[PDB]
Design a protein around this ligand. Structure first.
Ligand SMILES: Nc1ncnc2c1ncn2[C@@H]1O[C@H](COP(=O)(O)OP(=O)(O)O)[C@@H](O)[C@H]1O
Ligand SMILES: N#CC[NH+]1CCN(c2cccc(Cl)c2)CC1
Ligand SMILES: [Mg+2]
Ligand SMILES: [Mg+2]
Length: 265
């Protein structure tokens, strides 16, 4: 159906390990979108064909205001192309680099939007497993959308693929290669809440080896400026035992969230 000739390509929007993402306009309708380009030789070499299939299958069927749309795809014997909703305000990662830290209202609003998106995902037993600032995009009204479903799966699960880059957002059960479920995304939500308020993630370290140690032992402390309500929510999410981590309704109803968020459940 779709082919490369149907699109005019424009400015580079971002890069990932596999994805090179470009702004593009479809020629007959003038529809603006984002084209995510993957090289087949790199996909085959890394053995991640199955991840790509899951990204397409899972993401194309989800429909939620806080989740990025996948519209379709095509390929041409050197490349695979994913046709995505364009997010005009960029990544949360870029906003954090710009501002250094977010205030409590901005943070609580982003957490509400994440929790709504994840609540919808978990109702289908979909777990994302790669929630982190460079995969959170911003729509035209500044609203958060979750993207990059390459690591997503159905629960429960083990891991069959090699961990790539940073350990910073993963819970103990994932880094220890044990069996895991939906509660992995709740741990990541706690890491994000800390990083939004403080400006760095809570187990950050100079080497892989020490980061691993800090995560498995849950070694984090708070700077003086983090308030009692934020500390309570974060401490509830960063529990070693996944069954003790709260439900998403409990996050959305937490008094610090309700006091500070400017959007509803
Ligand atoms: N729909 C989009 N709109 C705007 N920018 C995007 C979009 N998708 C990706 N990007 C940019 O490209 C980067 C990589 O895309 P991603 O889908 O996360 O690739 P990878 O799977 O390689 O991590 C993002 O972190 C962001 O900077
Ligand atoms: N390397 C490689 C081989 N590819 C593996 C998976 N492929 C795939 C999966 C979902 C959607 C689309 Cl367009 C393509 C195509 C070929
Ligand atoms: Mg990504
Ligand atoms: Mg990916």
């Amino acid at each position: 159906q779709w082919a490369l000739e149907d699109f005019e390509i424009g400015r580079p929007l971002g890069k990932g390990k596999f994805g090179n993402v470009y702004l593009a306009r479809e020629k007959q309708s003038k529809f603006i979108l984002a084209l995510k380009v993957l090289f087949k030789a790199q996909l085959e070499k890394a053995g991640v064909e199955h991840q790509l299939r899951r990204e397409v299958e899972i993401q194309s069927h989800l429909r939620h205001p806080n989740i990025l749309r996948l519209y379709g795809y095509f390929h041409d014997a050197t490349r695979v192309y994913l046709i995505l909703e364009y997010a005009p305000l960029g990544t949360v990662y870029r906003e954090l680099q710009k501002l250094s830290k977010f205030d409590e209202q901005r943070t609580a609003t982003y957490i509400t939007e994440l929790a709504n998106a994840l609540s919808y995902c978990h109702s289908k037993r979909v777990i994302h497993r790669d929630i982190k600032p460079e995969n959170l995009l911003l729509g035209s009204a500044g609203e958060l959308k979750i993207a990059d479903f390459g690591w997503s799966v159905h629960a429960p699960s083990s891991r069959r693929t090699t961990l790539a880059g940073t350990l910073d957002y993963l819970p103990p059960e994932m880094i220890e290669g044990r069996m895991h479920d939906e509660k992995v995304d709740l741990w990541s939500l706690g890491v994000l809440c800390y990083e939004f308020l403080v400006g760095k993630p809570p187990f950050e370290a100079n080497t892989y080896q020490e980061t691993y140690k800090r995560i498995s032992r849950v070694e984090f402390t708070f700077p003086d400026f983090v308030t009692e309500g934020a500390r309570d929510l974060i401490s509830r999410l960063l529990k070693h035992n996944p069954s003790q981590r709260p439900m998403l309704r409990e996050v959305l109803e937490h008094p610090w969230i309700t006091a500070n968020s400017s959007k509803p459940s």
